[PDB]
Amino acid sequence: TKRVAVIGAGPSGLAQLRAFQSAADQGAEIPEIVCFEKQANWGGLWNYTWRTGLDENGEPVHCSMYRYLWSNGPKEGLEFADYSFEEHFGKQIASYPPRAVLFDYIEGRVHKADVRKWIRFNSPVRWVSYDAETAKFTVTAHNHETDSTYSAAFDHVICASGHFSTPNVPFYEGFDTFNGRIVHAHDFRDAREFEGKDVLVMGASSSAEDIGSQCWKYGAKSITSCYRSAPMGYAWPDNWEEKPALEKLTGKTAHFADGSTRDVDAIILCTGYKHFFSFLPDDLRLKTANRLATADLYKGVAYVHNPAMFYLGMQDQWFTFNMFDAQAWWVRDAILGRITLPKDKAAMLADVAERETREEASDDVKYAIRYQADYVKELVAETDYPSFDIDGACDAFFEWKKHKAKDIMAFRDNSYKSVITGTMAPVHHTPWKEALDDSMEAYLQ
Amino acid sequence: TKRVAVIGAGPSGLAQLRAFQSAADQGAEIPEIVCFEKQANWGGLWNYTWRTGLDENGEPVHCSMYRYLWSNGPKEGLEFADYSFEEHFGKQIASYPPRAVLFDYIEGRVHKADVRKWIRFNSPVRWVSYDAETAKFTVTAHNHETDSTYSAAFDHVICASGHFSTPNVPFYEGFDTFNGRIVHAHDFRDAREFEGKDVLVMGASSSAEDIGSQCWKYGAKSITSCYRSAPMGYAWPDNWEEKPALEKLTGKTAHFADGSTRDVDAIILCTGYKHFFSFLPDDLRLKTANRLATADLYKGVAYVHNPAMFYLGMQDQWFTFNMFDAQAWWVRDAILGRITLPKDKAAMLADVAERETREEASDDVKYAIRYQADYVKELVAETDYPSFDIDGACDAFFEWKKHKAKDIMAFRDNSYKSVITGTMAPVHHTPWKEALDDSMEAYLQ
Ligand SMILES: Cc1cc2nc3c(=O)[nH]c(=O)nc-3n(C[C@H](O)[C@H](O)[C@H](O)COP(=O)(O)OP(=O)(O)OC[C@H]3O[C@@H](n4cnc5c(N)ncnc54)[C@H](O)[C@@H]3O)c2cc1C
Ligand SMILES: Cc1cc2nc3c(=O)[nH]c(=O)nc-3n(C[C@H](O)[C@H](O)[C@H](O)COP(=O)(O)OP(=O)(O)OC[C@H]3O[C@@H](n4cnc5c(N)ncnc54)[C@H](O)[C@@H]3O)c2cc1C
Ligand SMILES: NC(=O)c1ccc[n+]([C@@H]2O[C@H](COP(=O)([O-])OP(=O)(O)OC[C@H]3O[C@@H](n4cnc5c(N)ncnc54)[C@H](OP(=O)(O)O)[C@@H]3O)[C@@H](O)[C@H]2O)c1
Ligand SMILES: NC(=O)c1ccc[n+]([C@@H]2O[C@H](COP(=O)([O-])OP(=O)(O)OC[C@H]3O[C@@H](n4cnc5c(N)ncnc54)[C@H](OP(=O)(O)O)[C@@H]3O)[C@@H](O)[C@H]2O)c1
Secondary structure, eight states: OOEEEEEEOSHHHHHHHHHHHHHHHHOOOOOOOEESSSSSSSSSGGOSOOOOOTTTTSSSSOOOOTOOBBHHHHHHGGSSSSHHHHHHHSSOSSSOBBBHHHHHHHHHHHHHOOOGGGHHHHHHHHEEEEEETEEEEEEEEEEEETTTEEEEEEEEEEEESSSSSOOOOOOTTTGGSSSSSEEEEGGOOOOGTTEEEEEEEEEEEHHHHHHHHHHTTTOOOOEEOOOOSSSOOOOOTTTTEEOOOOOEETTTOOOOSSSEEESSSEEEEEOOOOOOOOOOOOTOOOOOOOOSSSSTEEEETEEOOTTEEEEEEOOOOOSSSSHHHHHHHHHHHHHHTOOOOOHHHHHHHHHHHHHHHHHHOOOOOHHHHHHHHHHHHHHHHHHHSOOHHHHHHHHHHHHHHHHHHHHHTTTTTTOOOOOOOOOOOOOOSTTTTTTTOOHHHHHHO | OEEEEEEESSSHHHHHHHHHHHHHHOOOOOOEEEEEEEESSSSSGOOOOOOSBBTTTBOOOOOOTTTTTSSSSSSGOOBBBTHHHHHHHHOOOOOOHHHHHHHHHHHHHHHHTGGGGEEEEEEEEEEEETTTTTTTEEEEEEEEETTTTEEESSSSEEEEOSSSSSEEOOOOTGGGOOSSSEGGGGGHHHHHHHHGGGEEEEESSSSHHHHHHHHHTTTTEEEEESSSOOOOOOOOOOOOEEESEEEEEEEEEEEEEEEEEEEOOOEEOOEEEOOOOOTOOTTOOOOOOOOSTTTTTTTTEEEETOTTTEEEOOOOOOOOHHHHHHHHHHHHHHHTTSOOOOOHHHHHHHHHHHHHHHSSSSSHHHHHHHHHHHHHHHHTTOOOOOOOOHHHHHEEEHHHHHHHHTTTTOOOOSOOOOOTTTOOOOOOOOOOOOOOOOOHHHEEE
């Protein structure tokens, strides 16, 4: 018989479990699945907590979400393929669900799946080794509930431990003497803290955009964002100037590359994350940049230096839930032997290279979206996963992109066509800038 | 030769290296020494950084110190018996040096000791296992300069990783929703942030004492401190007040056991730390409360379930630097063979029980001080550690305590007798509450 260890109970690990349970429904025998989760409850990033730094058990807080956060993409872009919205909420909702709403939705199908009984919560994995003679992986985990660490052999390890949790926190001259709050996005929690204040937001990507907005919505005196590469470029509110790279701080004085100046009360470092695995030896440890074509993963899921070990979700993410399903099915199939991996490490490296180069062929954002779209499509064709209208996802993604470039601060006040009934979403009872309440029930009436 | 691995290059780990160096200079054979240090530099808690949470490498920030921190005790009670403050600084400085100053003193000693060549920085330990059949420990460490993990065998392991870095962070009702800053002391860095605010300081121990005082010195609008057991009991300033146990928060308003009420702008959790070792298996992982009689440590230093493993600094601390020394010399001598461990585990366990029982014989403060004094005497008598006036050091704490009950806010404007000379240190050039500059240059003029 076989046993498989899944590290993480975020959307990815959860997707993996759904994958095995699905095959077992159909009538397939499956190996024992053990899923280790560090937190007390499933949901990965979506499992919000006020904590920052180390959690109550002393482990580093995984959560990177803050209050007042709504879906960054239209929900129509992420709608599951085996369980849809209305089926869980009963009704049609607006196009940008708040965190709680989406968490409840993520919760919906996982509960319905009866997978929870596979998850060991409060159980950070401490280490994973591979013995070539047994052909077994040895996972080592600490059970916080009983304060005891133990070890166990598995035939496979599927690492679903995320990569938007270990922050890149760069030092700039003046940071250690700045008389104000300096915080990475991983630790940002409540925008009310910056009400009436002058915020500096470093970065030009998703977090800078959304965290900047949050603080604008909740009353910052002003927003200053700064880029080091391409500006976010959107049409910013009155209190929002975008500026070139920081040189240094002197007091509360930000000096920028164009010689200009601004005094700010607070700095939110929206400078991204690293793929970091504290629990992996060199010959298992994935090392890569954040991007659509992840180094060292054949088919974007199988570890080239040891193909009995897998990784989910390690790509940068235009597509999310639907991708992790596509990935999890594939990894499932490879484990059940419906799919046979190459024994030729050269050829697995070839596959990665090809992905990298194709990814690099164009820098246009619609090309990039389309690209991960072709990826999902690739995967879904190679397993019994329900083929679905991905191009329909893409078309939503394209409308999204036109709404943000249109009016960055109102883009969440739009609706998009559904992909299962082509029916364009209703509007929300309330405008985003007015919708100060965050709660699920406020959203749902 | 034998090899010994030292975990940590703070004061205890550094004391341990000095110990081994001193022995070898005198011409005793010594095992090879490898000291693994997480941080970029030595210093342990005294190596300050602005960072909180995870460090530039993704490892948890060890630092628990803040800006404007000064020695909370008389420098007289911690002076290296083999390296006087006079030998280092050349003159005679006041009794409560700022962080930077004592840091330079710690570094001064290991400078002269030429032991830095033994230290591997940016190299946190990942794991320690013992194998009884080879009678060697296996140490897995990760080198962030080469981003490479490796494993090596050692005949002894001396863990000096400290226990004031992994915080105890309780949940109280309303923490999830408080409109303001909630920060544990371990993440606290700059008191200026609290200028003008009604601060809530939870706790009644050293941390709440000092951090509350920093907040007040640097202009907090008001301080409220709450206890769950015994009030701190000091004659506080007029804008400072102690309340019984917090029950909950409602918006910005705190509720205490006495049914009273106060609105607060920020909460600093000075609720302490845990003994936490993310890198040890059940069979080597010290588990103990923070006190003077540490559990499962023979002579306060040798893990009783495997006495080839030792631990430094795990006790609560009145005495600090020279205790670390006594311990370091002891452990050294036990490893060299100048001391023999009891063949009977019952004996080691017996030794720990008598220490607990004697710590518990009385709850009076002077008696605790004397108790730790006796431990240092006990240890010192068994090695060739330089003798030094322990009683005198003890009288320094007795006067220190007196000065604190007399004036909790000025106790640092005081001098004490050198354990070597007997004469009162010079007065510093500025009252503490006015000494806003904490630099080593301002201090030494
Ligand atoms: C701030 C933020 C906002 C986002 N918003 C959106 C959005 O609106 N829409 C969208 O589609 N996508 C969004 N994403 C993308 C997000 O990554 C995915 O939606 C999804 O949460 C990732 O799935 P995952 O399970 O692979 O990663 P994670 O959600 O990070 O799951 C990893 C899980 O593994 C666990 N784990 C980690 N290490 C260990 C260990 N050693 N032992 C045991 N368990 C461990 C963690 O507890 C965690 O629960 C957002 C990401 C971030 C950072
Ligand atoms: C806020 C605060 C203020 C204090 N002020 C004073 C004072 O004024 N006077 C005084 O006498 N005492 C003070 N103390 C007590 C303090 O514990 C000692 O001064 C001293 O720092 C103890 O030294 P140590 O080496 O035992 O522990 P630490 O100083 O904590 O040293 C531990 C070292 O081990 C390293 N380490 C940890 N884990 C790993 C790993 N897995 N791999 C590799 N390396 C690792 C850490 O990076 C760290 O450098 C204070 C303590 C605190 C928390
Ligand atoms: N529904 C979703 O899937 C969803 C969408 C939004 C966010 N996200 C995911 O998470 C990622 C985006 O979140 P993110 O913004 O937090 O990460 P990020 O994409 O890596 O953005 C990092 C930003 O910080 C800048 N930066 C990095 N290091 C810096 C430094 N040392 N100094 C100054 N600036 C620096 C970057 O500039 P440079 O460009 O020059 O590096 C970049 O603008 C996406 O890639 C995405 O997959 C999830
Ligand atoms: N050389 C010196 O100047 C000097 C002298 C005195 C002490 N010390 C040292 O410095 C250390 C103290 O630092 P510290 O104050 O940060 O830690 P600490 O001594 O453990 O103090 C913790 C405080 O928080 C309280 N607390 C703990 N858990 C709580 C919870 N869940 N809810 C509410 N309150 C809670 C404690 O109350 P309870 O007591 O009820 O648990 C205590 O008041 C000691 O370990 C000691 O070594 C130094």
